[PDB]
Design a protein around this nucleic acid. Sequence first.
DNA 1: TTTTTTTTTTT
Length: 594
Amino acid sequence: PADALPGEGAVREVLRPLLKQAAEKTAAGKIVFAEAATGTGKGRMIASLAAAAAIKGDTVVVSAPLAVTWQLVNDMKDIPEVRRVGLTLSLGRPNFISPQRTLEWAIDNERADLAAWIEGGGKPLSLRSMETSKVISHELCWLLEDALLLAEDLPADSLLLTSEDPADCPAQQLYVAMRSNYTEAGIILCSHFMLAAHTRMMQMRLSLPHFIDTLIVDEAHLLEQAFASVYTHTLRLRPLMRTIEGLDALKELFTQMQVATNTSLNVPLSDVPELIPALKDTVKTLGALPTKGMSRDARSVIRIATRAANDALSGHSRLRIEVTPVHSYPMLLSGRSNLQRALLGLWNATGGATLVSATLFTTGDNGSLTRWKLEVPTERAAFLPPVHPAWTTAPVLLHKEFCAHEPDDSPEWATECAQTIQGVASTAQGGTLVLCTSYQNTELLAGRLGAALGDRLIVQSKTSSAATCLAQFKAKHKAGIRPVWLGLGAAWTGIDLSDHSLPDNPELDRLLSDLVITRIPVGQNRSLTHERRTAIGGFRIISQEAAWHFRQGLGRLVRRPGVTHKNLWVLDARIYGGAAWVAPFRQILDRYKK
DNA sequence: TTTTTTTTTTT
């Protein structure tokens, strides 16, 4: 490896050519599309990219999900180039905790370690918080993640740093002071939400440079969603209505919302039954109430809901009514279906960028859907070839057996698919994950399998999270019993079903021996940005996005080379029929054999 | 040529 990039030594040999290409084109000013599989060590490649850019003198920003942050700090904690230029991190308020409230909670619930941690400065206690504290050269006190270690059942939202907490409380001081972290280091880590929020603040005229010389976006497929959430302001009624109890026109606003299975989807002002009177009356009834005596945590409820009111005030945004999983509560949203001005503002403030993810391309090296999703200027965009190593598909045997009945939410399909699922559960030599597209489909399957499989069965639901079911899936495997997981939603994309009780030895990993696709993941995306992107583009957008979700669902099986005896099952009979529209999903499966 | 997911951790 003559004349290698900094940190290139610990990069997998397979990704060295891609790292070389990405480094050159990013240095050339292009916004680079670099796609590589999960187990190829994209974190090491990113660390080498950032270090090489940093020693050029570049102010470098690495935007990545907070979960990935700990891996990225470690991967470039020790390479000499970043050691000289320094590596810092930018954290928003939701990372921290109110010392007053979290201590006031520990006394109420008699949690000795929790109160004793806050008494004494809320010092970092985890290895991650302590080590990142040394790497940052800042002491990361009052961290939420540390507080969870002492009491997992703490009401996280009740205790988080709001913007309303007093200036004198240590947590807000630490956050506000650390807003200047980009001053004191060459490479800056943050989440996609932080980058989107920074871009929005830049547009409207602090925590990031005004111009980013080089930007690496890890898990870049999620960056689009972060902009949508940041640019969406949602009004929650029951928390507000309950907070004033401790106005009548707002009750009439809810009654009015009821007049207008699609309820007010992607319609800015075409329906105005009484919303603009009810909005304006709510605007004044909430902002005129006395700040004096308003609880330091209740003024936040007022502020966030008037923000949603004044985001629906402009009329420059779409509206949509949603309902909580717990109960049929009223929620009003003001999102944006066109995100070009904001995204373009980000890309202008960037000299060069590398977009890194495992699913960036629709087919081959075509990143046009991602280029349009993120509004990457075509002049600056660049599509490098992907890295799809052979070992990502080798341990997988694809079975011909499938469910003849087509998925139509019927009881008829549910039992037939359940019989095939039971057949998979018997032959399974480990954990089994069956992927469902709907709550209805998985609840139907649960009704047909709850008695048959008994304790083995895990059902994701409105009351059972993917994280909850993931914990039970690991636990049931710990107890030697072979679980089956009726998974939906986040189980499709973003669960690490690789066993960490077997670090050095992947050949003996059998946490997930059977993956079962019950249905092609069509209709899995309903965001305002994508729904508009579908209305203009047609069913191609539907099929391309479904294939992306399909590849991500298949990516749960193999997470590192050297595993063996992995089973892949796709039961959607449409795959095996003639229909031309299922041709892409056929082609993905064509890379397995026998 | 299709269909309903609750991500994340910003102000």
